[PDB]
Design a protein around this ligand. Structure first.
Ligand code: 2CV
Ligand code: 2CV
Ligand code: CAU
Ligand code: NA
Length: 297
């Protein structure tokens, strides 16, 4: 037995150590591929950078510690770092879904009103939107956790708060529902609604083609190119997290209905999404050229 443990430990410390690499590496790749490639410095890729820092923090901070928790069974870093870890964990997920939301709206405006967009949206502004998207996210994730709004009266929760070795995120039903709606479900329904519109209008444009000029076109042509890449990016994020949050809502009405491992599974599917973006950006010939550039092929 005491050996069958040892296998699973170092065996799992291998996957954990691996995903960290695939996450950090992949995203640092994406941040450099924009930070040093003239044609990959669109406005949209400023958000993609933002999006890639959320994922980057996930790989340096969220997972490492979350690793040492699945593997070693307990929490080893004290009751404070438990809160901070949980906050950073919640922050990144909200900040992601929020940037993915902006990115959706952003395209919609640039596709339907390619104009008011071009004059209104400046790089200096886009940063203010990124800052605003983090500022909100921070506020919704960190503060309520800091103020213990999440805690339960239940003896389960109560005992887990007492123990500096428990770092289960046992949350009262209210925080569950409220925080999952604010941080996830609304942003997601907005993003899906906007994304279906951006898809429909994108179709009507190609349906009504070479009816526009070469000037009215070589500026639409450019913004359409990369839509599908983004539509994937969104569609994956949705599938990677919807289960975790579907299960979270289910767990409110009916604790002891969906197995605790399936819960932790899904949360890990969620962290997995942080390493899927760069792989998906390899659709783009420019990113691919930039990744080879950086790896020194
Ligand atoms: C952006 C975050 C969204 C806000 C979520 C926090 C609100 C939680 C409500 C509150 O103020 N509580 C006490 C504050 O400590 C929690 C209690 O409501 C809770 O203990 C129970 O009454 C029910 O939740 C039953 O599960
Ligand atoms: C972001 C919200 C979701 C945006 C969805 C974008 C769909 C636009 C239509 C589309 O992607 N194609 C037309 C057939 O449906 C295929 C090709 O256009 C594509 O492979 C590339 O060539 C790029 O032009 C991407 O538009
Ligand atoms: C068990 C903890 C450490 N894992 C948290 C997940 O990574 C992400 O969970 C969330 C992300 C964003 C908003 C959230 N609201 C929640 C309410 C209850 C449970 C998780 C979340 C949650
Ligand atoms: Na604790």
């Amino acid at each position: 037995a005491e050996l069958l443990s040892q296998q699973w430990e170092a065996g799992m410390s291998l996957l954990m150590a691996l995903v960290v690499l695939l996450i950090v590496a992949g995203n640092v790749l994406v941040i450099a591929a924009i930070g040093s490639t003239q044609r990959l410095q669109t406005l949209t890729n400023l958000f993609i950078t933002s999006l890639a820092c959320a994922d980057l923090v996930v790989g340096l901070l969220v997972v490492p510690f979350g690793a040492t928790l699945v593997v070693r069974g307990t929490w080893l870093w004290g009751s404070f770092l438990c809160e901070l870890w949980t906050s950073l964990d919640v922050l990144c997920v909200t900040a992601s879904i929020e940037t993915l939301c902006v990115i959706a709206i952003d395209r919609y405006l640039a596709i339907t009103s390619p104009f008011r967009y071009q004059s209104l949206m400046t790089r200096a502004r886009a940063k203010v939107i990124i800052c605003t998207v983090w500022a909100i996210s921070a506020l919704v994730s960190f503060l309520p956790i800091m103020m213990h709004w999440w805690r339960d009266e239940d003896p389960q929760a109560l005992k887990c708060y007492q123990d500096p070795g428990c770092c289960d995120f046992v949350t009262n039903r209210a925080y569950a529902i409220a925080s999952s709606i604010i941080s996830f479900y609304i942003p997601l329904l907005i993003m899906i609604f906007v994304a279906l519109r951006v898809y429909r209008e994108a179709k009507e444009q190609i349906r009504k083609i070479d009816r526009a000029s070469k000037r009215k076109r070589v500026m639409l042509m450019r913004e359409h190119k990369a839509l599908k890449t983004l539509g994937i990016i969104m569609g994956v994020f949705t599938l990677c997290w919807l289960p975790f949050f579907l299960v979270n809502i289910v767990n409110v009405f009916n604790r002891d209905l969906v197995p605790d491992w399936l819960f932790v599974a899904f949360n890990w599917l969620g962290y997995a999404n942080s390493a899927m973006n760069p792989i998906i950006y390899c659709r783009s010939p420019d990113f691919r050229k930039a990744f080879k550039r950086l790896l020194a092929f």
